[PDB]
Design a protein around this ligand. Structure first.
Ligand SMILES: CC(=O)N[C@@H]1[C@@H](O[C@@H]2O[C@H](C(=O)O)[C@@H](O[C@@H]3O[C@H](CO)[C@H](OS(=O)(=O)O)[C@H](O[C@@H]4OC(C(=O)O)=C[C@H](O)[C@H]4O)[C@H]3NC(C)=O)[C@H](O)[C@H]2O)[C@@H](OS(=O)(=O)O)[C@@H](CO)O[C@H]1O
Ligand code: NA
Length: 754
């Protein structure tokens, strides 16, 4: 590949990043994308340092601060993008061009050059600047001189001599992985287009292959579809999206060329569209539970990341086989159509606009999110859906950190891995509308919490500490899931709790047992902590209403149920007092992220909780949530033994779903829950249909070689579906013995015949 091939590649990259070849004339959405492009460009030009002998490019960005160095370069690449976009205000403007070139030249001289040692965050030097400077070189290729290309290529190569590695020499260089490997390889590939370097280009393309190989530990994609970055944090929704985005752009750039990605194992990455990404996409947003510290970012939200994922999937779909293309397009049409809260075209780039318009021109229909369960045991996450809702559970364990904080972000998120119950609904803004600026970080929905105040950054940054718990894990059979978490509290309080969730097609039954702590403080369990925005949503009870006055907590009378207008129902499954608080909360994004705005946001919440008191001995809870239930259906939840608690203690927790004729259990110790026994830790769901017993089982520690069940519903003499060895114990009950060696928390499905 020579001059013509490199020119075609550069032209293709500019087409991709500007959308210059696909602007529809007179289209209002294209006009709006151009307007947003123009306003950002004008903002940057207004901030140019025009001073003689300047020591910065922009008056509000110091080159001595590595994040502001990155923003200097991303502003220059944005300006170059605008200069290259037909109909943009600065399109082809020579005075603007000259300012961009001078900015690149001075940022090189002053700071980012082949003689400079890294100072501060490695990512700035190796990923933030190279991607932007490479883009700028390609955008401006007809305008920069050879000597300028030499200088800027030399700078990139100094900081990133090999994109398969990361960190400056003084630190010791390690293999780059996951999103970091993609981003380093992107910067080098685009730089290799500018400099016409096939050797560097080929090595960077070859570096992509590692990121879609299945892993069983560390960072990457697991066979169950989990995605981890930073070793201990579930990360599909932020770092996973960075990986998805970069590969979409590079696969598209290189396809059909001498440099095309030809590794056949890239099918694993395509499999991850539905296996990893789609289940954690909720009406256009990535689930908070899989986006780590990014929850703290006012302008990098679940909708921003979901929109990036949609762009990427649409871009990838252009190269897929027809059935897969249409499936991915239907999925995206659904995530777009259902999201009226942050419509994808508002502030969309020209390329994003074009992909969304191309989708709408295919006529591919919107696909609904499927009901039922998607489990991710390698990352301690589960997803559950029914009509009008999606539950995302956020656990932690000896494999998965309580939380990630870092770079001044999410330092207060230490309870976000304490068994959170995110109920996503048609309230699309629930977790987005200043939730993370205003919520009570000590009363997040679903958690059990020791009320001891914890410092910011408790347990350390970067997910360095994990709870030394017994297990967290899950299974599911048909419409019912069983999820368990042994919660060990952050901050060395000694909090312990056994939390389980039994999730049907409509209702979530929440059981807690064996709760105690060493701190001497009260312990709570949060039934909900629910953003009401500026609403005054009524809390209805058997007797009338509760918590009508903000700031005065009330205890629920005897009917045991409460309905929250615009949400659904809650009901107590024991005689514990339920405390109900309507409250107004305030906070700024600066309070949760060092980069957040200082603007104070004020939001109303409904907060429902159980108080286990001081010094609980084997404290417990039992409640249920019915998203979307009317007052009439909520009033009836506790009637007819629909949700039949079997056991709830330090040995096992179990419920039977009457309508679904299905029982679910978690086992902490060897023992029995009803007529089901287990020899050790287990998640089990079972249902009898006449003379056939169906079971789902997991071994949630991920470390036991065997597990034996004592079977419910009488005796069982053959195996119809699946594996396992039938036996009989000294007492005449049938047993099922499973080899669980290496199952990594995955579910075994079994069907037996009487
Ligand atoms: C300082 C240090 O040595 N810390 C490491 C830690 O490194 C940190 O983690 C990541 C990484 O990629 O591994 C890197 O996170 C990325 O940070 C940049 C800003 O620096 C962006 O954050 S933002 O400014 O809030 O935008 C970036 O956000 C993503 O950007 C983009 C994009 O630019 O294309 C798209 C997404 O929409 C947006 O989310 C952010 N990425 C994510 C996904 O949040 C940190 O800057 C770097 O400091 C880890 O290093 S590691 O390489 O071994 O993983 C950590 C692991 O234990 O070790 C610390 O020492
Ligand atoms: Na970590």
């Amino acid at each position: 590949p020579g001059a013509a091939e490199f020119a075609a590649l550069r032209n293709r990259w500019v087409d991709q990043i500007t959308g210059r070849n696909v602007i529809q004339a007179g289209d209002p959405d294209f006009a709006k994308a151009i307007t947003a492009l123009n306003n950002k460009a004008a903002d940057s030009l207004a901030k140019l340092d025009a001073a003689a002998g300047r020591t910065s490019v922009f008056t509000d960005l110091s080159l001595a601060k590595d994040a502001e160095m990155v923003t200097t370069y991303t502003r220059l690449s944005q300006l170059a993008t605008a200069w290259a976009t037909p109909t943009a205000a600065v399109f082809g403007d020579a005075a603007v061009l000259a300012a961009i070139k001078a900015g690149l030249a001075d940022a090189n001289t002053l700071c980012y050059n082949d003689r400079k040692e890294e100072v501060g965050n490695w990512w700035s030097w190796e990923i933030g600047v190279p991607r932007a400077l490479a883009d700028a070189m390609v955008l401006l290729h007809a305008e920069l001189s050879a000597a300028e290309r030499t200088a800027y290529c030399a700078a990139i190569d100094h900081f990133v001599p090999d994109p398969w590695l990361q960190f400056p020499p003084k630190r010791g260089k390690i293999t780059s992985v996951g999103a970091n490997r993609v981003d380093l390889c992107q910067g080098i590939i685009i730089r290799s287009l500018a400099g016409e370097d096939p050797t560097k280009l080929n090595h960077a393309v070859a570096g992509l292959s590692q990121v879609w190989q299945y892993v069983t530990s560390g960072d990457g994609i697991f066979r169950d579809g989990s995605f981890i970055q930073h070793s201990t944090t579930p990360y599909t929704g932020s770092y996973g999206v960075v990986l998805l985005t970069g590969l979409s752009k590079l696969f598209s750039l290189l396809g059909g060329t001498a440099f095309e990605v030809s590794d056949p194992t890239r099918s694993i990455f395509f499999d991850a569209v539905e296996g990893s990404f789609a289940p954690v996409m909720i009406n256009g947003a990535m689930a908070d539970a899989v986006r780590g510290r990014s929850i703290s970012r006012e302008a990098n939200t679940g909708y921003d990341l979901g929109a990036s994922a949609i762009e990427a999937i649409l871009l990838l779909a252009r190269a897929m086989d027809p059935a897969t293309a249409a499936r991915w397009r239907g999925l995206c049409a659904g995530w777009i159509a259902r999201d009226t809260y942050r419509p994808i075209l508002n502030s969309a780039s020209v390329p994003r606009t074009a992909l969304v318009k191309q989708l709408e021109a295919t006529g591919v229909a919107p696909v609904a999110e499927a009901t039922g369960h998607k489990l991710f045991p390698a990352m301690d996450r589960t997803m559950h859906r029914g009509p009008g809702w999606a539950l995302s559970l956020a656990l932690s364990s000896n494999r998965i950190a309580w939380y990630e904080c870092g770079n001044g972000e999410n330092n207060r998120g230490y309870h976000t891995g304490s068994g959170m119950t995110y109920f996503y609904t048609s309230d699309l803004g629930q977790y987005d509308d200043a939730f993370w600026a205003t919520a009570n970080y000590n009363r997040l929905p679903g958690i059990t919490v020791d009320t001891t105040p914890l410092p910011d950054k408790v347990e350390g940054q970067w997910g360095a500490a994990v709870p030394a718990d017994e297990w967290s894990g899950a299974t599911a059979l048909g419409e019912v899931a069983a999820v368990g978490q042994h919660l060990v509290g952050p901050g060395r309080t000694g909090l312990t709790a056994r939390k389980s969730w039994f999730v049907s097609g409509d209702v979530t039954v929440c059981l807690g047992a064996d709760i105690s702590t060493a701190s001497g403080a009260k312990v709570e369990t949060i039934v909900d902590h629910r953003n009401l925005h500026q609403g005054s949503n009524t809390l209805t009870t058997a007797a009338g209403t509760i918590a009508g006055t903000a700031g005065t907590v009330e205890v629920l009378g005897d009917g045991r149920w409460v309905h929250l207008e615009g949400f659904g129902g809650y009901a107590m499954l024991d005689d514990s007092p339920l405390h109900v608080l309507r409250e107004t909360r305030s906070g700024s994004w600066s309070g949760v992220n060092i980069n957040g705005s200082a603007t104070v946001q004020q939001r109303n919440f409904a907060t429902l909780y159980v108080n286990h008191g001081v010094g609980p001995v084997a404290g417990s809870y039992a409640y249920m949530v019915a998203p979307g239930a009317s007052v009439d259906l909520t009033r009836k939840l506790l009637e007819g033994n629909k949700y039949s608690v079997i056991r709830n203690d330090a040995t096992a927790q179990s419920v039977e779903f009457k309508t679904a004729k299905t029982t679910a259990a978690t086992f902490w110790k060897p023992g029995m829950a009803g007529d089901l026994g287990a020899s050790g830790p287990a998640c089990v769901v079972f249902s009898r249909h006449g003379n056939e017993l169906s079971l789902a089982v997991s071994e949630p520690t991920q470390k036991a070689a065997g597990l034996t069940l004592t079977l419910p519903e009488g005796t069982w003499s053959s195996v119809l579906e699946g594996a396992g060895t039938l036996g009989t114990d000294a007492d005449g009950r049938s047993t099922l013995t499973l080899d669980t060696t290496g199952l990594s928390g995955k579910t075994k499905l079994i069907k037996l015949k009487r």
